[PDB]
Amino acid sequence: RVASGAGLPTSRQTTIMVTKYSEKSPITIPFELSAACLTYLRETFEGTI
Amino acid sequence: ANKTLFKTIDEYLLRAKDCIRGDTDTQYVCVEGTEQLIENPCRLTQEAL
């Protein structure tokens, strides 16, 4: 605030204290796994090449 | 204002500024302008365009 001594008025409130709320915006994405790929991933049958 | 031109130009740059109230749609005469001031060259030159 700047100030003058004229008849026009000045404000006294200094350091206004406001609160701000957040807005939510979630994001999703699926990814798929076939059961054949999962069974060949885990259970190694140790056989051959 | 029938004076010498230096006191006339001091009347121009000091006294000859009207104020008009700036929140109505009709030009009301402002009383005691302490926030704005409407200076008139077209009162000093006494013509119109």
Burial state string for A25-49 with b = 16 or more CB within 10 A and e = fewer than 16: eeeeeeeeeeeeeeeeeeeeeeeee
A 2-41 near B (Cβ less than 8 A): 6-8
Structure tokens at A36: 């054949």
Phi/psi for B39 (5° steps) reads -85, 140
What distance in Å separates residue B31's CA from the closest CA in chain A?
A: 12
Name the resolution in angstroms.
4.0
Closest CA to B21 of B12, B13, B31, B11: B31
CA distance B41 to B17: 9
Among B21, B34, B36, B37, the residue to mutate for chain A (most A Cβ within 10 A)? B34
CA distance B18 to B27: 12
CB of B37 closer than 8 Å to CB of A6: no
Alpha helices in chain A (DSSP H): 35-42
